[PDB]
Amino acid sequence: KHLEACLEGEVAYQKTTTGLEGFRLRYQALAGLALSEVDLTTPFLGKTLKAPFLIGAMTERINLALAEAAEALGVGMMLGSGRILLERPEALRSFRVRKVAPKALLIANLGLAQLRRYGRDDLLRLVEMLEADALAFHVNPLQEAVQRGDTDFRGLVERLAELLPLPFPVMVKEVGHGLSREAALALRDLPLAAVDVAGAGGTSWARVEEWVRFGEVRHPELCEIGIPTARAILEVREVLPHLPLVASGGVYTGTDGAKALALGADLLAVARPLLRPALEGAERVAAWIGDYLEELRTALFAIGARNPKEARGRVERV
Amino acid sequence: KHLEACLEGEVAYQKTTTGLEGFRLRYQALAGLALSEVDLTTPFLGKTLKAPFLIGAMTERINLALAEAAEALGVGMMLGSGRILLERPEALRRVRKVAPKALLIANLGLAQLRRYGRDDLLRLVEMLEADALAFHVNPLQEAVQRGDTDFRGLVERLAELLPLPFPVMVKEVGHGLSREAALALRDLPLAAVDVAGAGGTSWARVEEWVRFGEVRHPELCEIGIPTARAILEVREVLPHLPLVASGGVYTGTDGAKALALGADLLAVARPLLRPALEGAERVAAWIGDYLEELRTALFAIGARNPKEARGRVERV
Amino acid sequence: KHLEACLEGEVAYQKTTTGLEGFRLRYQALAGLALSEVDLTTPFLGKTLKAPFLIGAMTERINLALAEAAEALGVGMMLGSGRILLERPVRKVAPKALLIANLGLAQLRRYGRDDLLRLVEMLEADALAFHVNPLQEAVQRGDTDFRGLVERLAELLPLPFPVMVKEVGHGLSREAALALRDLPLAAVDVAGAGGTSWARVEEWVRFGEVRHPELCEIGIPTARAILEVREVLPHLPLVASGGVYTGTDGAKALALGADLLAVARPLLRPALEGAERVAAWIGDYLEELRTALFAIGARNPKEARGRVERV
Amino acid sequence: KHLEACLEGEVAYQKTTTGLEGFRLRYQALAGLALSEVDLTTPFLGKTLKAPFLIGAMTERINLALAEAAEALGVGMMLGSGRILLERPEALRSFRVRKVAPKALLIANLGLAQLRRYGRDDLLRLVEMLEADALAFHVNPLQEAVQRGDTDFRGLVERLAELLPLPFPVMVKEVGHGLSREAALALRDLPLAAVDVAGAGGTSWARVEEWVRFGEVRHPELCEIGIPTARAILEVREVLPHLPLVASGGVYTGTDGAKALALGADLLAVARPLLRPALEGAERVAAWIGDYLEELRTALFAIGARNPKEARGRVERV
Amino acid sequence: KHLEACLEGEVAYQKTTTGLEGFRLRYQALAGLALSEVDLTTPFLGKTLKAPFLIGAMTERINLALAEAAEALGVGMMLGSGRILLERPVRKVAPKALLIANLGLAQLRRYGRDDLLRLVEMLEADALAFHVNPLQEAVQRGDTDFRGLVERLAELLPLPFPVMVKEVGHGLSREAALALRDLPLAAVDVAGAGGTSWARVEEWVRFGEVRHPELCEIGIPTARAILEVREVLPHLPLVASGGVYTGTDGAKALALGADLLAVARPLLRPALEGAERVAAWIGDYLEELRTALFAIGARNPKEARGRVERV
Ligand SMILES: Cc1cc2nc3c(=O)[nH]c(=O)nc-3n(C[C@H](O)[C@H](O)[C@H](O)COP(=O)(O)O)c2cc1C
Ligand SMILES: Cc1cc2nc3c(=O)[nH]c(=O)nc-3n(C[C@H](O)[C@H](O)[C@H](O)COP(=O)(O)O)c2cc1C
Ligand SMILES: Cc1cc2nc3c(=O)[nH]c(=O)nc-3n(C[C@H](O)[C@H](O)[C@H](O)COP(=O)(O)O)c2cc1C
Ligand SMILES: Cc1cc2nc3c(=O)[nH]c(=O)nc-3n(C[C@H](O)[C@H](O)[C@H](O)COP(=O)(O)O)c2cc1C
Ligand SMILES: Cc1cc2nc3c(=O)[nH]c(=O)nc-3n(C[C@H](O)[C@H](O)[C@H](O)COP(=O)(O)O)c2cc1C
């Protein structure tokens, strides 16, 4: 159903935008460097990816096409909520993807609200079964409100905070509505491995949720609520000046990814746009991502940056 | 192919603009002067042009129509990359024949200094009988085109073998020169600079259009410094070097704004491409009309010449 | 690539239409019957389908989703050109379901009597369908020779399994139907213009856009094709396909002289999402075809014949 | 719900039209008559109405506003399905409208499919309770199909045919999808008092029905099925050359009513367009209808017709 | 100026169309032939062209680009009014190519037998074409006297080289064809409405805009002109021109009764870019005309006749 909606409905934001359009990249006609010298290699969560890119979390045959491409290109990949795996270890055969992705970095996904019913061990089991290199918890009160699902988000930050110091790197992310600066403050003390701001502008899960319930978005404005990806990057970075940040949420082009990095991001993550190419097969997914990085490179090149790092600051507000 | 695209495709910028629309000219109803007294005469690169205008660089029969008009009106003209001439001296069939007096800036493009030197340059300005030489930088274009993508140490390779017999200038091809780009040139003894900013023709678009018959990465091709921003930024860094505003400065009124923001010369390329295909008379008509309005604009502004235009504009 | 284009490009016809819009169904407010009494059961190619519907030919994991649904609902299914199978040697999910193997006429120039039997064999198909498509092949720039294919079939015809001829969306004219009148075919698929234009799909694959629009709109509108072909082959069972995307349209198709409806492209996306989605699509289509036949006053696909008028 | 949909949804036909636009009225600049001499008086179902107009059937406080206006202007009125009254005689107090409409002609409404569960007496009781001057049965297989209600319309024409010869005049009508010529044939033998073709072009009850189920019309083409009001008039008249016919189904203006009459109708009936003015009160309803007849008169006047009858034939196909 | 207008103004017809859209080509999915066997070779005015195509008359450097392409592909070419040549006295690039000299009827009022021979002479043309255009001349406000021009030609006719009459885009009516039925012409160019409207081109030159739109839409649609003229001159070779801008349209043109297609304005811009560009344009046009004839079931421009129906 949710997969159906993302593929057939108007689930993207209609009024709010990532805000990246409000910034222009500083073009250096005389930055004097060679395109061949711009290196996208970037180490993330204890592994060296060939580009600062992560396939976004998506929730069976799609995962094998996504992963296969992740390996082929050398980029990371966040798995869909393995929440269903801790409930049916028999269903493990379908998230089994290491087979196609031997080396590729794989972030397992679970979602904070679950720490209210799962603990220390269960977690280890999940990262285990999947043979993941890390684990990501996603928070999403607005989505859950509109969906009318577990609507209780009390004391989840501490329940994590305590049982934290885990064997594998851990990161927190939203699902497209964004993480505010105060949200970043609430995480500043936990020893996280990284953060995914996943802001507004791309796919609105409040819309995806309503579309699943009515076959149309009945409360448009309610579903546009969120922190634009651009604002989220700036705000979160502002609070966590050193933790590696992932910009996701409508960062659908290489040029935009460059802007994302310039504003303070370290990694880019794309989800919905890969959903269709994933249905067509790994080759198609690899093609999509390949082209995205091909332009991210050219963008960094025109900016005068030799790598995702030197992009920082190379942008100005329109 | 490139000539085809500029003539048949959507090669102009779609979202980014020159930004000149963000400024209004300060109309002086009582500046108390006569239209007849506004003089466009302006000396550039060691020659006195009748108007602060340069026909933009364009790359065979078109050049003879452009030049012929350049003479007729007394404006300059930048030649297309004569890069092909240093490779096939036979095919040097030259426009001086139609343009005896007219100021002609030869064109070559920086990335070439990686394979050509001191002499070769002199030969080019020579063969053409040009009054100067212009090197153009364009990493973004070359990236999208997928051509020579190496721009390392080109500024110095020029810097050293610089002090040349003829005046030299650096220009972009429509994506613009940033203030830092102007900084990287501040030390070289250049004769002038052409900021050639975004807003007019996007060569990234022209390039993609040549490869797919359509622009596949629109946003990627809109990357650049708007002509208005480039004028302000570059002037800011090189307060005295003569500057050429080009890149979507398609009307006289816009040229006036360009000057007001800190430019000394205006340059137009693509818009002249079609009239050039129709003949010199048509090209002369176009440019004539442009200057006719530039004059009226300077007149309404209260400026007697391209110089007094400086500052006579405000941000909307 | 072709699968990519159908899923991402403007491959549907832009100017020519099926023409079904030119006809209105004769609504009988007092036909006096019960919706429950309208039966879609229809026997085709030696099997009894639960509705006069066939999943259109489409060319790997999609086929298993399409077939699984074909079984679930009791409708037929045409397989993609098994041409690739005779060069590099789904029943598992579809035990009972009627399956028409597909090959394409131009191949009889390089394959014969046996090879055919082998194909229907390997697939465990209930019949075999040859598709003709000169316009597509022209634009594609593929095998462009269609000489003597009708006879090469005509002779080696009388085959162990029922055989049918079809186009790929540009339609079969009345003269085309004449050229087939003598062959002992099991059925025909007019596959007319109005839905997906394979000339467009073909050009889109070559330029990422349709460069010769008008050239790709060439064809016989599905409505015209039904009328024309029926006119020539008054009894051979006919399949209406080519932009017959709704139940209401299917009803019109039948009313004009069709016996079966076939849908292709519209099922391509639901096929990528899985059998449940495909079954949902088709289920809904038949749900409306039934209501349409109901309002028309027809108790079955047959009584629909003639229950329509030109607007 | 149904009342909600007609008031808030796109329940009118989207592609099919009444078809009246395909005819132009024959304007007689020199028909040489006085506007004052065109008389709308027309006797229907044993009563003399002041204009060939009937308020369409609509299904509580609205009925009192509609009726009150019916009296005020001297036009008829068809009541909503009193089907609910034969099931809850206690609910009679709400259809009780004779109090406001002492004289006005009132056609009770019931709907054919009910003769499968009600008989001779029950009918008399309904016309009785309401103190109606006649009874109208409505057929609507397409609506019922889409609604998913009683979908069995077998032998309803005869069940009526036999127990017919009733104490009060009886008429058959559709609900907006129209009656075909064959439909008219199936009625040619029954001794009906009149017929309401109620064709397509105005409100599509298939759309109203789907809108109630999904909050949107999911099968547009399916809901456009029907006989355009113009076609229905011609076709039915063709079969029943003398039975008085009512043209309804998108005949929303006086000028259109004139066209309706010209094509062979005797009475015009309007429903949905009166629904909102009915919610505002009798005065508003009277205003609407008053204005409609004011233009019908002018139209008949320009046509050269002194009354609804002389309108017959005064129109041509564009 | 006129060259400027055609290149920069809205000189095409705005309301009237060629009318070719009113016909659909009869697609023969089973015409059973090979694309390779459709031959465009067609002999015209005493020469064998490789395709039934003629570059339209256009009026200096453009002509060398057009001609050079004419040779390259093997198609004909009509020269601009050489009227200016008989007042102030391209084969070099086009040695073999068929070249129709152009002059225009209204000139026979001031030029005679010899002068004509001189023109065809100087140009080394293979024939001569006179163009009539009262509507253009009216709007232009030029020589507006067209009296007795048909006879002045009629008499001094029987000329050493083949002669043909044409309009300039407003078309030749059936009666116009009647007035020519007696003269021994080599061929006719109906040059109908639907493409470039010279009344518009003319007004655009005078006001920089079309002030009397409806006045400039006056004319016989190319489709009607083909039918009407053919009707009167069942055997004289006919050229369809006037908005016949695509191969598919050319096919329709032929099907309705034309023998040759001629394109003008659409070649004007590629002509400004050079012969290669012009050749590309025409090459692509014939490439589709071939495919169209192929789908129609026609082996050559002749078998196309009648292979079309009215929509
Ligand atoms: C089909 C689909 C499934 C998803 N499943 C998950 C999931 O299981 N867990 C999660 O944390 N996010 C999930 N997401 C969210 C993305 O990882 C993330 O919210 C992103 O911001 C939305 O993609 P973006 O805007 O490019 O489109 C899913 C998104 C899509 C489209
Ligand atoms: C047909 C055409 C050919 C050109 N050729 C050259 C060239 O050889 N070298 C160069 O440095 N710029 C060339 N240019 C670029 C212009 O000189 C310059 O980039 C300008 O900013 C684009 O024109 P503008 O925006 O008015 O249109 C060419 C532009 C056009 C339209
Ligand atoms: C992805 C796709 C694959 C197809 N593959 C074949 C094929 O292998 N053989 C064939 O004869 N037709 C094939 N078709 C054509 C259809 O069977 C048929 O031409 C139909 O008329 C097009 O579907 P329709 O108009 O509903 O959409 C294919 C169509 C689609 C969309
Ligand atoms: C709120 C509403 C309630 C209705 N109730 C009935 C009803 O009970 N019985 C009936 O036979 N028709 C009913 N109708 C139908 C009308 O009498 C008739 O179908 C008409 O053709 C629709 O109105 P028209 O097209 O102007 O809008 C109802 C229509 C509306 C808008
Ligand atoms: C630039 C241009 C110049 C032309 N010059 C002539 C001419 O000298 N004599 C003539 O008879 N027709 C001339 N024509 C007309 C064409 O030969 C003919 O009228 C044709 O129908 C218009 O081209 P078509 O509709 O494809 O565009 C000219 C057309 C154009 C566009």
Q: Which residues in chain A are closer than 8 Å to D217, comparing Cβ atoms?
A: none
Residue A180 sits at the vertex; the CA angle it makes with A179 and A184, to the nearest 5 degrees, is 80
Q: Do B217 and A299 touch (CB under 8 A)?
A: no
Does residue B283 have a known ligand-binding role?
A: no
Which residues in chain B have their CB less than 8 angstroms from residue E8's CB?
274
How many C-alpha atoms does E251 have within 13 Å on its Cβ side?
32
Cα-to-chain-centroid distance, residue C90? 19
Report d(CA A56, CA A203) in Å as an integer: 12
Q: Residue C229's CB: how many other CB atoms inside 10 A?
A: 28
Four-residue CA torsion sign, C55, C61, C65, C70: positive
CA distance E255 to chain C (A): 14
Contact residues, chain B, for E273 at CB < 8 Å = 3-4, 7, 277
Q: Which of residues 107-126 of C touch A (CB under 8 A)?
A: none
Residue found under tokens 């397509």? D200
A149 interfacial to chain D (CB closer than 8 Å): no
How far apart (Å, rounded) are the C-alpha atoms in residues B241 and B257? 19
* C5: Cα separation from own chain's centroid: 19
Between CA A129 and CA A86 the distance in angstroms is: 10
Ligand 3 site, CB within 6 A: C 3, 6, 56-59, 80-81, 102, 104, 131, 168-169, 191, 195-196, 241-243, 263-265, 268
- Alpha-carbon span A14 to C236, nearest angstrom: 52
Alpha-carbon distance values, E129 to B261, D108, E101, E134, E159 (Å): 59, 82, 6, 16, 12
The resolution, in angstroms to one decimal, equals: 3.0
> What's the rounded Cα separation, in Å, for the pair A141 and C221?
52
Length of chain D: 318
On whether any CB of chain C is under 8 Å from the CB of D141, the answer is yes
Rounded Cα gap, residues E128 and E118, in angstroms? 11
Closest ligand 4 atom to Cα of D111? 11
Q: Are B108 and B83 in contact (CB under 8 A)?
A: yes
Strand partners, D42: D49
Residues A111 and A139: their CA atoms lie apart, in Å, by: 6
Give the start-to-end residue ranges of the domains of chain D: 1-318
Q: Quote the CA–CA distance of C12 and C265 in Å, as a whole number.
A: 9
DSSP chain C: -HHHHHHHS--B-SS---SGGGEEE---TT---BGGG----EE-SSSEESSSEEEEEE--HHHHHHHHHHHHHT-EEEEEEGGGGTT---TTT-SSS-EEEE--GGGGGT--HHHHHHHHHHHT-SEEEEE--HHHHHHHTS--B-TTHHHHHHHT-S-SS-EEEE-SSS---HHHHHTTTTS--SEEE---BTSB-HHHHHHHHHHSS-S-HHHHT-S-BHHHHHHHHHHH-SSS-EEEESS--SHHHHHHHHHTT-SEEEE-HHHHHHHHH-HHHHHHHHHHHHHHHHHHHHHHT-SSTTTTTT-EEE-
Owner of token pair 């029954």 = D190
Spacing, Cα B304 to ligand 5 middle (Å): 48
Structure tokens at C40: 């879609």
Tokens for C80, please give them: 């993609």
**Contacting subunits of C (3+ beta carbon pairs below 8 A):** A, B, D, E
CATH topology of domain E1-311: TIM Barrel (3.20.20)
Cα–Cα distance between E97 and E48 in angstroms, integer? 9
Q: What are phi and psi of C235, to 5 degrees?
A: -120, -25
Of B85, B137, B87, nearest to B106 by C-alpha is: B85
Give the span between the Cα atoms of C289 and C280, in whole angstroms.
Answer: 14
Token code pair at residue B28: 């002086």
Q: Of the candidates E285, C210, B217, which has an alpha carbon nearest to the alpha carbon of residue A296? A: B217
Token pair listed for B74: 């007394």
Whole-angstrom distance, CA of residue C190 vs CA of residue C104: 14
How is residue E148 written in tokens? 């007795």
> Residue E129 forms beta bridges with which residues?
E102, E164
CA distance D139 to D156: 9
Pairing of strands D267-270, D245-248: parallel
Q: Which residue of A has its CA nearest to D215?
A: A214
d(C-alpha B135, C-alpha B191), whole Å: 12
Q: Which two tokens stand for residue A192?
A: 């996280």
**How far does residue A120's CA lie from ligand 3's centre (Å)?**
53
Mapping DSSP onto H, E and C, the string for B4-26 reads HHHHHCCCECCCCCCCHHHEEEC
Torsion sign across C-alpha atoms D166, D169, D175, D177 = positive
Spacing of C-alpha E139 from chain mean position? 21
- C305 C-beta neighbours (distance < 10 Å), count: 15
* Count of other CB atoms within 10 angstroms of residue A88: 9
Q: What residue's CA is closest to ligand 4, atom 13? A: D57
- Hey, is the C-beta of C59 within 8 angstroms of any chain D C-beta? no
Q: Is A227 exposed, middle or buried (0-12, 13-18, 19+ CB in 10 A)?
A: buried
Residue with tokens 């189920």: D213
Ligand 3 atom closest to the Cα of residue C131 is 11
Which of D43, D47, D104 is closest to D70 using CA atoms? Answer: D104
Return the CATH fold of D1-318.
Answer: TIM Barrel (3.20.20)
User: Is the shortest distance between the CB of B182 and ligand 2 below 6 Å?
Assistant: no
- The residue among B117, B119, B191 whose CA lies nearest residue B158 is B117
How would you label C107-146 residue by residue, b for 16+ Cβ within 10 Å and e otherwise? bbeeeeeeebeebbeebebbbbbbbbbbbbbbbbeeebbb
- Rounded-to-10 torsion of CA D138, D139, D144, D149: 70
Coil/strand/helix, residue E183:
coil
User: Residue B10 half-sphere exposure, CB side, CA atoms within 13 Å?
Assistant: 11
CA distances from A198 to A212, C201, D161 (A): 21, 37, 70
Please state, in angstroms and rounded to a whole number, the distance separating the CA atoms of residues B176 and B234: 10
Residue A207 counted as an annotated binding residue: no
Q: For residue E192, give the nearest of E163, E153, E231, E218 by alpha carbon.
A: E218
Residues C18, C261: contact at Cβ < 8 Å? no
Contact call for residues B53 and B266 (beta carbons, < 8 A): yes
Query: What is the rounded CA–CA span in Å between residue C275 and residue C264?
Result: 15
Measured in whole angstroms, the distance separating CA E27 from the mean position of its chain's CA atoms is: 27
Structure-token pair, residue E34: 């090979």
Look up residue B271 and give its two tokens. 């818009």
Supply the DSSP string of E248-305, one letter for each residue. HHHHHHHHTT-SEEEE-HHHHHHHHH-HHHHHHHHHHHHHHHHHHHHHHT-SSTTTTT
Angle between helices E265-273 and E61-73 (to 10 degrees): 100
Indicate if the alpha-carbon torsion angle B113, B119, B121, B123 is positive or negative. negative
Q: How far apart are the first and last CA of chain C?
A: 40
> Which atom of ligand 3 sits closest to the CA of residue C56?
17
Residue C173 contacts residue C225 (beta carbons within 8 Å): yes
**Coil/strand/helix, residue E90:** coil
If we measure between CA atoms, which residue out of B313, B312, B305 comes closest to residue B49? B305
Assess contact for A74 and A106: CB atoms under 8 A. Answer: no
Please state, in angstroms and rounded to a whole number, the distance separating the CA atoms of residues C67 and D55: 54
Q: Is D242 exposed, middle or buried (0-12, 13-18, 19+ CB in 10 A)?
A: exposed
3-state secondary structure of E84: helix
Alpha helices in chain B (DSSP H): 2-8, 61-73, 118-128, 139-145, 154-160, 179-183, 203-212, 218-221, 227-237, 252-260, 270-278, 280-301
Chain centroid offset of residue A139 CA: 12
Structural contact between residues C162 and C186, judged by C-beta atoms closer than 8 angstroms: yes
What CA–CA distance (Å, rounded) separates D195 from C30?
A: 13
A123, A135 contact by CB (below 8 A): yes
How close is the Cα of C293 to the center of ligand 4, in Å?
A: 24
Rg, C-alpha atoms of chain D: 19
| C209 close to B (CB below 8 A) | yes
The partner residues of D53 in beta bridges, in order of sequence, read D268
Measured over the CA atoms of residue D140, residue D145, residue D151 and residue D155, the dihedral's sign is: positive
What size, in residues, is chain E? Answer: 311
Cβ separation C144–E35 shorter than 8 A? yes
DSSP state of A91: G
- Of A170, A171, A158, the C-alpha closest to A198 is A171
Query: Considering only CA atoms, which of B97, B184, B172 is closest in space to residue B142?
Result: B172
Whole-number Å distance between alpha carbons of A115 and A157: 10
Neighbours of D200 (CB within 10 A): 31
Looking at domain B1-316, what is its CATH homologous superfamily?
Aldolase class I (3.20.20.70)
DSSP class of A37: G
Residue with tokens 């818009």: B271
Q: Which long-range contacts (CB under 8 A, 24 or more apart) does A282-287 make?
A: A282/A64, A282/A65, A282/A66, A282/A68, A282/A69, A282/A72, A283/A69, A284/A65, A284/C4, A285/A55, A285/A65, A285/A66, A285/A68, A285/A69, A286/A68, A286/A69, A286/A72, A286/A73
**Amino acid code (one letter) for C29:** A
Cα dihedral C162, C167, C173, C174 in deg (nearest 10) = 0
- Where do the H-state alpha helices sit in B83-202? 118-128, 139-145, 154-160, 179-183
DSSP structural state of residue B269: -
Question: For residue A93, what are the contacts with CB-CB under 8 A and spacing of at least 6?
Answer: none
Backbone φ/ψ region at C302: left (φ over 0), alpha (ψ -120 to 50), beta:
alpha
C98 C-alpha vs ligand 1 centroid, how far in Å? Answer: 40
> At which residue do the structure tokens 């026609």 appear?
E298
Distance CA D27, CA D33 (A): 13
Is D284 in contact with D64 (CB distance < 8 Å)? no
Among residues B158, B167, B155, B161, the alpha carbon closest in space to that of B125 is found at B167
Q: How far apart are the C-alpha atoms of A157 and A172, rounded to whole Å?
A: 10
How far apart, in Å, are the Cα atoms of D263 and each of B98, C27, D225?
Answer: 80, 20, 22
